[PDB]
Amino acid sequence: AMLDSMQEKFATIIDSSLQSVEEHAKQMHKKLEQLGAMSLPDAEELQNLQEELANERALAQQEDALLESMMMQMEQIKNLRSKNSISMSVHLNKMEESRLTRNHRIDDIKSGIQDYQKLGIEASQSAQAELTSQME
Amino acid sequence: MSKEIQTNLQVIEENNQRHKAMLDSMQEKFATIIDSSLQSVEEHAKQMHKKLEQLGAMSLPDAEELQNLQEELANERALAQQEDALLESMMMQMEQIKNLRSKNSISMSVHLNKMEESRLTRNHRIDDIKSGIQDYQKLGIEASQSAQAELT
Amino acid sequence: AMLDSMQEKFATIIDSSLQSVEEHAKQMHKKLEQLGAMSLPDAEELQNLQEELANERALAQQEDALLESMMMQMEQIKNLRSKNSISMSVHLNKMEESRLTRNHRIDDIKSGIQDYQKLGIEASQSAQAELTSQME
Amino acid sequence: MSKEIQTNLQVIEENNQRHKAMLDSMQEKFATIIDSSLQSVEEHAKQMHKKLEQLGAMSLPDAEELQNLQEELANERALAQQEDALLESMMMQMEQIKNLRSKNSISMSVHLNKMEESRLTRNHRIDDIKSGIQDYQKLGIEASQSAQAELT
């Protein structure tokens, strides 16, 4: 029974094998721990991009509201100008009538002065027609 | 008295002469002023007519000014028409850019969700592998006992 | 003295002449009154054009203030977007580093599994080197 | 006892045979498991290596997604650059239209002042003519008296 000296080598290799299976299990699990630890910063970065995307939506919404408001006010001014411009064309037309009318009135007065000069000659001849008539 | 009647007829021959040269000088002097009277009516009519000439002469410059106001009013509509075209064009283009942005930002959210799936999947796989290391270490130590309990 | 009968015609023409000089003076002055009356509506029309011109100035001033304000706000949004876009490029670069790093860590673990398979064969030969050695 | 020693040597000849075929079967059975042990270490190493293969295979799609995010970011700058060019262009043009309007409105005020002068001048001329009618009627009635006071 020289087996007692052979089996002492049996616990020496089974134990030395198991200690390597646990050192591999220890080493790998440490590597897998820190690898899986990257998940949180990765999630962090996504949340940041997510927030920046929401800012873009916020900003686009403010921009659209701003331009609409600007266009609104811009349209009111356009209408006011248009009303103001129509008012002008009307007053210019009135002034054109008042100018033509003034011309007619001036021509009437010119004609009336001519009528006066005409009827003055008619009076001069009609008066000398009495003075040459009272020559009898 | 035949000679006496002849001189009484000389009296009359000068008597009417005293009325003739007196009336001939009255109608000559009265007609000399009616003529000067018409001359004041014609010089006043000329004077006044000149005034009305230069007054009516203002009409054409008045019309020039109105016509200038007319042109400046038409320019204003021109400018108003350019301004409206410009803003319309601008709004047109701004609207495309807005749409392109929205399409681009939506595409982005898709990739962000895509990536979040890829992150969760990655975690499951890491956990799956971690479990396999635990499974190996457990079935490894339990295998050692099955050998040490028989030969020892 | 048959002049008393001639002078009665003298007051008849001097009076008839003067009454025509006053009827002309009356008629003309009436014409000149209403002609000069056009001055007030003419002045009115000018004042209206004057007010419409001031409206144009008012309107142009509002328009200039409006566009300036719009441009201001438009510039703030541009800057905010630009800051938001720079922030993105930064997070994308971080994620690219975290991806490369993750690749190195995975390769290390792959290599460490290979080292384990290698040193397992070294153990298998070294163990059978004892079992073929204890054949003596 | 010569025959007796031969059989005691047969005992030993089977005694060591009882240890030989017992040890030959112990190292054959012990080496038969060290071989199966390495086989579990190599199949686990293969199994795990597969897991790491498909996990590392996620890297390329991850890179594709980042590259898409990169392109969508560059598009956004493109769109931002078009938008700024557009508004600049628009402001440029709006500024000319504004100037042209001011020039046009100032021209107008000049004509309005021009016309107001022409209106005041017109009034002086009307008053001047009215005065001439008064002057004529006054110097006309006073002329009538100078004649009626002498002949009447």
Numbering used by the authors:
A (entry chain B), C (entry chain B): 660 to 795
B (entry chain A), D (entry chain A): 640 to 791
Task: Give the exact sentences the study uses for this entry.
We purified a minimal BASS domain construct that assembles into a tetrameric, 220 Å long rod based on EM (KLP61F residues 635–835). This BASS tetramer formed hexagonal (P6422) crystals, which were used to determine its structure to 2.6-Å resolution using X-ray crystallography with the single wavelength anomalous dispersion (SAD) method from selenomethionine-and mercury-derived crystals. The asymmetric unit contains a canonical anti-parallel coiled-coil BASS domain dimer encompassing residues 640–802 of both chains, which represents the basic assembly unit of a Kinesin-5 minifilament. This anti-parallel dimer is associated with a second dimer through a crystallographic dyad axis to form the full tetramer, whose dimer–dimer packing surface extends over a large area (≈7000 Å2) and is stabilized by sequential, alternating hydrophobic and ionic residue interfaces, each occupying three-helical turns. The resulting four-helix bundle, which is 22 Å wide, 26 Å high, and 260 Å long is the longest helical minifilment structure determined to date, and it displays a striking organization. It consists of a 220-Å-long central bundle that is visible by EM and matches fairly well to other anti-parallel four-helix bundles, where helical axes are separated by equal distances but then transitions to an asymmetric diamond-shaped bundle near its ends, where C-terminal helical axes become displaced and N-terminal helical axes are closer mediated by helical bends, termed elbows. The hydrophobic central interface (A) is bracketed by an ionic interface (B), another hydrophobic interface (C), and finally another ionic interface (D) positioned at the ‘elbows’ marking the transition between anti-parallel four-helix bundle and parallel coiled-coils at the ends.
Of these, the MT-based motor, Kinesin-5 plays a key role, being essential for the assembly of bipolar spindles in most eukaryotic cells and driving or constraining the rate of spindle elongation. Purified, native Kinesin-5 is a ‘slow’, plus-end-directed, bipolar, homotetrameric motor capable of using pairs of N-terminal motor domains at opposite ends of a central rod to crosslink MTs into bundles. Structure-function analysis of the Drosophila melanogaster Kinesin-5, KLP61F, identified a central bipolar assembly (BASS) domain within the coiled-coil rod that is critical for this motor’s bipolar organization and whose deletion results in disassembled, mostly monomeric, Kinesin-5. Instead of the expected antiparallel arrangement of two side-by-side parallel coiled-coils proposed previously, we find that the BASS domain has a novel four-helix bundle structure, which very likely has important implications for its mechanism of action within the spindle.
